[PDB]
């Protein structure tokens with residue numbers, strides 16, 4: 001049934017995942033010297049290509065492939081349109097490895113046909129607290145804590161095959177070649193997400209949406225006027241009134257994050273994330289890169305009281321193409337990124353997120369039910385969407401965990 005994922009080091013079934021108790025590796029311990037030095041064989045009409053993320057043309061090529069061929073919703077109404085500036089930010093974090101961005105081009109015209117990206121991440125991915133306490137009481141704490149130390153692994157995203165090339169087994173060939181390039185750097189684990197079911201997720205979380213411009217959302221059929229809104233005489237006025245937001249933030253200490261905030265945000269974020277079972281570890285340079293405001297890409301606000309940053313939130317932008325709508329070309333979506341609250345309830349901090357997003361012209365705020373994102377769903381008027389984001393490891397045994405125990409936000 002899975003001609004490719006059968007040949008790979010991942011759990012093969014739910015309830016192998018349900019069985020697993022300790023974190024740890026799957027494949028044979030291997031060495032760099034074992035890995036072929038030559039690229040994986042590919043048909044002679046194609047060629048492997050390592051884009052230069054510092055070249056505007058190369059970024060443009062990847063931008064057009066993804067604009068026309070990347071992720072759609074289940075009804076083919078929307079497709080992500082990541083910007084070139086977003087792709088530059090996502091694909092070139094501190095100490096990125098240029099060789100981990102892998103593409104396939106047609107040799108004759110150099111047309112981009114397929115792409116996959118890997119970047120570094122430092123991830124806590126040892127045994128979950130729940131399996132560790134079981135282990136303690138059963139005598140096995142040492143084996144449980146064996147892989148507690150954050151690991152320098154690969155995070156995979158932006159897998160894409162051109163629509164004209166679909167179901168020709170090109171995605172396996174890409175994943176093989178990315179794995180070879182990563183393994184040649186002496187890295188042996190990857191983390192990735194997908195909105196499809198594959199063998200086998202260690203966590204799954206529902207999508208959630210918060211309407212900011214319900215007029216537009218209904219016009220492009222992201223949303224409907226719910227049946228309940230019919231035995232009111234007036235549908236849309238009532239819908240606007242329901243989702244209306246203040247014009248200005250209500251926390252008085254709120255301002256955009258600036259470079260001098262990097263150490264304190266790093267500290268309050270690391271203290272919050274270290275509570276979850278699977279989560280990233282960031283250096284100052286990675287906090288700067290992923291959280292300092294960048295126009296049209298990432299937006300970050302701190303609450304500063306008496307010169308001390310005590311809370312912050314961030315969100316990132318992905319516009320979606322509205323596939324065949326006359327009136328609207330684009331859906332302008334904000335996605336909740338990292339945050340930390342120490343002085344105010346999380347609902348109060350995220351309200352300010354919604355207020356800034358709406359003021360800056362976003363149409364909806366989207367998120368997955370990871371981190372403590374459930375604690376503000378009802379009071380902030382989020383709704384569950386129709387789908388789940390699934391979390392996976394390559395070469396890592398891991399128990400099934402709840403999504404409220406995951407702290408890795410994917411872009």
Ligand SMILES: CCCCCCCCCCCCCC(=O)SCCNC(=O)CCNC(=O)[C@H](O)C(C)(C)COP(=O)(O)OP(=O)(O)OC[C@H]1O[C@@H](n2cnc3c(N)ncnc32)[C@H](O)[C@@H]1OP(=O)(O)O
Pocket residue numbers: 001002003004005006069070071072154156157158159160161162165166167168169170171172175178179182183187188189190192193194195196198394395
């Ligand atoms: C140590 C380092 C390791 C690094 C590598 C770690 C692994 C990284 C893994 C990648 C994580 C990516 C994270 C993201 O970016 S998730 C986003 C994925 N991108 C899209 O959804 C964009 C729209 N779709 C496409 O471009 C194509 O449909 C793709 C490229 C998805 C498949 O192309 P196509 O439709 O032309 O099919 P094929 O005949 O060539 O290949 C069929 C095989 O592909 C397996 N397939 C289908 N979808 C996915 C999927 N989303 N992840 C993994 N595998 C997937 C499928 O089960 C089948 O295997 P098997 O069932 O026959 O066994």
Ligand SMILES: Cc1nn(C)c(C)c1Cc1nnc(-c2cc(Cl)ccc2OC2CCNCC2)o1
Pocket residue numbers: 071072073074078079080193195207208209320331333335366367368385389410411
């Ligand atoms: C395309 C498209 N555009 N829109 C607006 C939607 C709801 C889709 C479908 C869709 N596919 N994924 C999501 C998603 C939906 C939500 Cl609510 C939150 C995160 C989502 O995925 C992100 C970005 C890419 N990497 C994983 C995290 O939404």
Ligand SMILES: [Mg+2]
Pocket residue numbers: 161165166167168169170171
């Ligand atoms: Mg294919």
